[PDB]
Design a binder for these strands. Structure first.
Ligand code: SF4
Length: 76
DNA sequence: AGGCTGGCAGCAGAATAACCGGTGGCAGCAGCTGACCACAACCGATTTTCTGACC
């Protein structure tokens, strides 16, 4: 079916929870071409997923952050 | 004098209406819990790593 075209499970699944701001960036933008962004993002927002890339967007424990804040002192 | 030998005959089996007492089960439910999620916050370093000034 359309399973190998689905960009979620094409490669290694441990990529999409890597705890670097730059590592998961290609994981987030790899769901640009995903055919099911609407329903996946809708399910992720309704069930309140606390981790990882969902619907081509990252998640905190309840909501969506724009980009994950890096380790260290943030920029003034 | 009967007996035990002989067929002869006959048969089983197989195939193709109430009471009373008591006693234990049981289900329903307030009412101690008491362990348990469970959010939800709040801190305890921890490490990085800028940020800010020092001379
Ligand atoms: S997170 Fe995005 S890319 Fe991955 S399966 Fe869901 S919609 Fe597709």
């Amino acid at each position: 079916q359309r399973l190998p075209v689905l960009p979620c499970h094409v490669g290694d699944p441990d990529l999409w929870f890597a705890d670097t701001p730059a590592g998961l960036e290609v994981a987030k933008t790899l769901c640009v071409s995903c055919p099911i962004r609407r329903q996946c993002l809708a399910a992720a927002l309704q069930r309140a997923e606390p981790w990882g890339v969902w619907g081509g967007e990252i998640f905190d424990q309840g909501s969506i952050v724009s980009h994950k804040r890096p380790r260290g002192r943030p920029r003034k």
